[PDB]
Design an enzyme around this catalytic site. Sequence first.
Site, mmCIF file in Angstrom:
data_model
loop_
_atom_site.group_PDB
_atom_site.id
_atom_site.type_symbol
_atom_site.label_atom_id
_atom_site.label_comp_id
_atom_site.label_asym_id
_atom_site.label_seq_id
_atom_site.Cartn_x
_atom_site.Cartn_y
_atom_site.Cartn_z
ATOM 1 N N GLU A 222 9.369 -6.581 8.290
ATOM 2 C CA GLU A 222 10.250 -5.545 8.836
ATOM 3 C C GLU A 222 11.454 -6.131 9.605
ATOM 4 O O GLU A 222 12.106 -5.438 10.374
ATOM 5 C CB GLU A 222 9.442 -4.612 9.735
ATOM 6 C CG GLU A 222 10.001 -3.232 9.934
ATOM 7 C CD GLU A 222 8.951 -2.272 10.466
ATOM 8 O OE1 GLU A 222 8.823 -1.176 9.890
ATOM 9 O OE2 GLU A 222 8.242 -2.608 11.445
ATOM 10 N N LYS B 286 6.076 -3.226 13.203
ATOM 11 C CA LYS B 286 5.050 -4.119 12.695
ATOM 12 C C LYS B 286 4.880 -5.445 13.454
ATOM 13 O O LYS B 286 3.781 -5.977 13.541
ATOM 14 C CB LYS B 286 5.345 -4.402 11.227
ATOM 15 C CG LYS B 286 4.951 -3.263 10.319
ATOM 16 C CD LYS B 286 5.230 -3.605 8.869
ATOM 17 C CE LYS B 286 4.818 -2.465 7.976
ATOM 18 N NZ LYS B 286 4.907 -1.197 8.698
ATOM 19 N N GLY B 287 5.960 -6.003 13.977
ATOM 20 C CA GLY B 287 5.844 -7.262 14.687
ATOM 21 C C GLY B 287 5.255 -6.994 16.059
ATOM 22 O O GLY B 287 4.338 -7.690 16.526
ATOM 23 N N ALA C 253 -0.826 1.912 12.612
ATOM 24 C CA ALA C 253 -0.887 0.496 12.951
ATOM 25 C C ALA C 253 -2.187 -0.179 12.465
ATOM 26 O O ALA C 253 -2.526 -1.280 12.896
ATOM 27 C CB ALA C 253 -0.712 0.311 14.461
ATOM 28 N N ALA C 254 -2.908 0.479 11.568
ATOM 29 C CA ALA C 254 -4.160 -0.061 11.041
ATOM 30 C C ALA C 254 -4.031 -1.504 10.540
ATOM 31 O O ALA C 254 -4.733 -2.407 11.012
ATOM 32 C CB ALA C 254 -4.663 0.821 9.926
ATOM 33 N N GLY C 255 -3.135 -1.705 9.578
ATOM 34 C CA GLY C 255 -2.851 -3.020 9.051
ATOM 35 C C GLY C 255 -2.281 -3.965 10.087
ATOM 36 O O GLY C 255 -2.497 -5.171 10.017
ATOM 37 N N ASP C 256 -1.541 -3.427 11.050
ATOM 38 C CA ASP C 256 -0.957 -4.283 12.074
ATOM 39 C C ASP C 256 -2.096 -4.834 12.935
ATOM 40 O O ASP C 256 -2.150 -6.024 13.239
ATOM 41 C CB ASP C 256 0.070 -3.522 12.918
ATOM 42 C CG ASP C 256 1.318 -3.114 12.110
ATOM 43 O OD1 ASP C 256 1.768 -3.906 11.241
ATOM 44 O OD2 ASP C 256 1.857 -2.004 12.355
ATOM 45 N N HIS D 108 -11.760 -6.131 10.809
ATOM 46 C CA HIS D 108 -12.191 -4.814 10.336
ATOM 47 C C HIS D 108 -12.510 -3.860 11.489
ATOM 48 O O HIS D 108 -12.058 -2.704 11.503
ATOM 49 C CB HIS D 108 -13.428 -4.928 9.445
ATOM 50 C CG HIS D 108 -13.123 -5.124 7.994
ATOM 51 N ND1 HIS D 108 -12.126 -4.435 7.349
ATOM 52 C CD2 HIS D 108 -13.703 -5.922 7.066
ATOM 53 C CE1 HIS D 108 -12.094 -4.807 6.079
ATOM 54 N NE2 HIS D 108 -13.039 -5.706 5.885
ATOM 55 N N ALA E 107 11.249 1.781 18.091
ATOM 56 C CA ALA E 107 10.842 2.953 18.841
ATOM 57 C C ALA E 107 10.454 4.021 17.830
ATOM 58 O O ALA E 107 11.293 4.448 17.032
ATOM 59 C CB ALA E 107 11.960 3.442 19.744
ATOM 60 N N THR F 258 -6.099 -6.060 1.722
ATOM 61 C CA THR F 258 -6.682 -4.955 2.448
ATOM 62 C C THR F 258 -6.705 -3.751 1.527
ATOM 63 O O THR F 258 -5.774 -3.536 0.743
ATOM 64 C CB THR F 258 -5.915 -4.672 3.759
ATOM 65 O OG1 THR F 258 -4.599 -4.206 3.469
ATOM 66 C CG2 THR F 258 -5.816 -5.940 4.604
ATOM 67 N N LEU F 259 -7.783 -2.984 1.598
ATOM 68 C CA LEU F 259 -8.073 -1.978 0.580
ATOM 69 C C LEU F 259 -8.287 -0.597 1.165
ATOM 70 O O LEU F 259 -9.073 0.178 0.638
ATOM 71 C CB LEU F 259 -9.317 -2.376 -0.214
ATOM 72 C CG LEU F 259 -9.317 -3.817 -0.738
ATOM 73 C CD1 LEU F 259 -10.712 -4.312 -1.159
ATOM 74 C CD2 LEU F 259 -8.288 -3.991 -1.867
#
Lengths: 306, 306
Positions: free
Chosen positions: A140, A40-41, A249-252, A276, A12, A220-221
């Site tokens: 995580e 993350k999950g 949450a970009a990477g997620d 992307h 949360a 990822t860059l």
Amino acid sequence: MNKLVVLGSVNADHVLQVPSFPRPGETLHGRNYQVIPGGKGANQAVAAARMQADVGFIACVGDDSFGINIRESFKLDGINTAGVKLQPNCPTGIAMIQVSDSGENSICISAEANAKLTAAAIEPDLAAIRDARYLLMQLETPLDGILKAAQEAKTAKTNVILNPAPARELPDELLKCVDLITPNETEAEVLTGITVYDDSSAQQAADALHCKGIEIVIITLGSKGVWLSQNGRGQRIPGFVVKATDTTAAGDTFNGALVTGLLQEMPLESAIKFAHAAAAISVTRFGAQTSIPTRAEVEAFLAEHS
Amino acid sequence: MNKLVVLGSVNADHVLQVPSFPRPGETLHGRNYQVIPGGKGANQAVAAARMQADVGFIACVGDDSFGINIRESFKLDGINTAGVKLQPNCPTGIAMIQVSDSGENSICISAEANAKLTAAAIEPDLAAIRDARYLLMQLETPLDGILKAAQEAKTAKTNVILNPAPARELPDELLKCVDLITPNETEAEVLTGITVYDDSSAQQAADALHCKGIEIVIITLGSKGVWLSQNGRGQRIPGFVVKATDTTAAGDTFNGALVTGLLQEMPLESAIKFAHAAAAISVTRFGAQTSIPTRAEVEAFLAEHS
Ligand SMILES: Nc1ncnc2c1ncn2[C@@H]1O[C@H](COP(=O)(O)OP(=O)(O)O)[C@@H](O)[C@H]1O
Ligand SMILES: Nc1ncnc2c1ncn2[C@@H]1O[C@H](COP(=O)(O)OP(=O)(O)O)[C@@H](O)[C@H]1O
Ligand SMILES: Nc1ncnc2c1ncn2[C@@H]1O[C@H](COP(=O)(O)OP(=O)(O)O)[C@@H](O)[C@H]1O
Ligand SMILES: OC[C@H]1O[C@H](O)[C@H](O)[C@@H]1O
Ligand SMILES: [Cs+]
Ligand SMILES: [Cs+]
């Protein structure tokens, strides 16, 4: 049997905007308090599910109101929640996220229910891992759970995607089981020691992971796109140009979208570009799952970018 | 009609125990996530109640399960919650709280329902304020509401005790109707400009407030007790020394106890000493209202100490 199985955390997010970075002492007046479903999950399974993947989710939530409710919400999202356990007398993991107006974010995370996702906890989930085509995981939740899942997946010829986030080091034994790994710049460094300055280093970073037994490496860059290396052959696949306001949450999102593409028999390079597009959308919106786009929003996005 | 009227805030305290306090660009790991009855207004009303003051509380709670529930709990402490309003479609005030081993805490508050305790909102409460001999307030609710109360108190022989927490600047129209102010050290500074570091500075700050019309000033100094000044005659009254588990609500407990003591005709010096005992017991316990001692506990502590 879900073709995609995501294993990972549920938080949360208690978000509060604060004028200054928090310091002990006087009570500081905050504002715009929200409780946002994060983790993350959760964010990645929600990503895949919203990208319409055939996804099941392995996770540990609390028996507070939040844990009880977010499990139902996952169902509504199209996530198979069979593997989502409710932990008795545990709050759900929480992120105490103080967004400081002076830019710099105060983050306090407590595992809570997430600490319960152990190698033994996921035992009934093993079969779902064997039958999947892909297993997606982050970092995580406890490592023994993650490691147990990957090991089960190798012998089943399930493909294992590891998003090694949050940043932490990992044993050879797990890396060796990972078919595809997607660190960000920070995480590739943590995992390899090789800091990623450019293509040359990104490729060394990648090759270090190739030597750990990982066929495909995707680093990822941030706004610089991604560095894709497949069996030593590396190349930069750039992402989209958007006004980024929150990359929580970009990477997620990227991982969720990426694995969904591959499951659609997209060539790797295309699946990546697709991911992307999803992540780009997300970096334009506030909060964890509150920012994760739908497959429709992505196709709409991709259409609009020609 | 209650002899003491407490007006102020209610918060749900979202509390994490942390090893240390967070560094700007770094992710703190916390534990024992807890949601705890809090808010300075409620804390002091609960404190006075437990000190067996004849106390009514004027506050705003939200219509979430927390606010409904806590208002009820106030009754159980003998607080007249007649003036405690339930605010529709607003969550209860929150506090995001990190408590370290040292007993230190950082508190960020979100007003929420507390923002509804306006001057207009306390119109039905003015009789209770006039009929009281003591009005005790703090600063987690709207200023217009605090002001209005102080004024109605002065017309009807009602001593006003302001607890100027959390730190903010106050208008003179408020201070001149304050019979007794109780800033901590940060708040004294914010109110007078005069940092309080010692006996002399403690008196400078105090007489500044005496020239703001306030007859009696009490500057709380944490473990160093308080500084007491009656029209240009200051002195330090030591508290009691305890090991600090959590200091959230030490000052709230102090204010609550103090006003009660005064109310029960303890000479000014005895009431303070009394209040010290309550607050010292409170800093030994964790969380806001969870730490506020009973009257018997304080007598016991006073019989011990002596
Ligand atoms: N430093 C952090 N800031 C925000 N969320 C975090 C952080 N660390 C872990 N999380 C959790 O993971 C999710 C966000 O992913 P994260 O990789 O932290 O974003 P970022 O791109 O800022 O690193 C959130 O839902 C939150 O619960
Ligand atoms: N500023 C940005 N603009 C456009 N796309 C972005 C931006 N930041 C991240 N992305 C997308 O998000 C994906 C996640 O990568 P990255 O940002 O490195 O992960 P994280 O934010 O979790 O560190 C990237 O591969 C890219 O697709
Ligand atoms: N460490 C402590 N030991 C004993 N009493 C304390 C302590 N800290 C605070 N108090 C009590 O609380 C009242 C005000 O304390 P305060 O200035 O709010 O300290 P803090 O902000 O560190 O909690 C004083 O009356 C004092 O009696
Ligand atoms: O005085 C401590 C209280 O102040 C803040 O308002 C928090 O709610 C906390 O409970
Ligand atoms: Cs975001
Ligand atoms: Cs306390």
